[PDB]
Amino acid sequence: HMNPPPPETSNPNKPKRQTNQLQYLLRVVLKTLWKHQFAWPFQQPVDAVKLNLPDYYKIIKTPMDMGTIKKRLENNYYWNAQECIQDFNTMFTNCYIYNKPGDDIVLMAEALEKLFLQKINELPTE
Ligand SMILES: Cc1nnn(C)c1-c1cc2c(cc1F)c1ncc(C(C)(C)O)cc1n2[C@H](c1ccccc1)C1CCOCC1
Numbered sequence: 001h002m003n004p005p006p007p008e009t010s011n012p013n014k015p016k017r018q019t020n021q022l023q024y025l026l027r028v029v030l031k032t033l034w035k036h037q038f039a040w041p042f043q044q045p046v047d048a049v050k051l052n053l054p055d056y057y058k059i060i061k062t063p064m065d066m067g068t069i070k071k072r073l074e075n076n077y078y079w080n081a082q083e084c085i086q087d088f089n090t091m092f093t094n095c096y097i098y099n100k101p102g103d104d105i106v107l108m109a110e111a112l113e114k115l116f117l118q119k120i121n122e123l124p125t126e
Pocket of ligand 1: 041042045046047051094095098099104105
């Protein structure tokens with residue numbers, strides 16, 4: 001009946017780092033997916049109140065969205081690229097869990113996922 005609070009995007013207790021991999025994840029990976037026509041349902045946490053789905057946050061215990069990823073990268077929340085990649089993986093996995101193959105949202109996630117995995121193969125060295 002209420003939306004849970006969004007995931008943290010900032011932590012003063014969390015050590016900050018700016019690596020070539022992390023600048024690539026913001027400037028190339030995030031930027032590509034953020035401007036894609038299918039990005040919009042993934043750009044903010046699932047507003048399960050507006051959308052009238054109070055079962056969303058009962059099935060999905062680890063929510064993630066691109067808005068949260070974008071802020072985390074801008075806030076140097078991540079120490080390594082692998083924590084950011086795991087958040088992208090969580091965002092897509094959540095969509096596949098709640099929904100089922102052939103659903104338009106699932107097809108939109110797959111197109112974004114395809115484009116993400118292509119960009120991650122091209123990740124620079126440390
Ligand atoms: C991600 C994600 N992962 N799982 N889900 C359920 C979503 C998700 C799905 C969303 C929206 C937001 C979401 F975060 C959303 N926002 C607004 C509207 C309008 C404007 C219409 O009112 C429709 C929306 N939905 C739609 C849908 C609603 C309910 C069940 C499934 C899908 C989809 C939006 C694309 O086109 C396909 C349907």
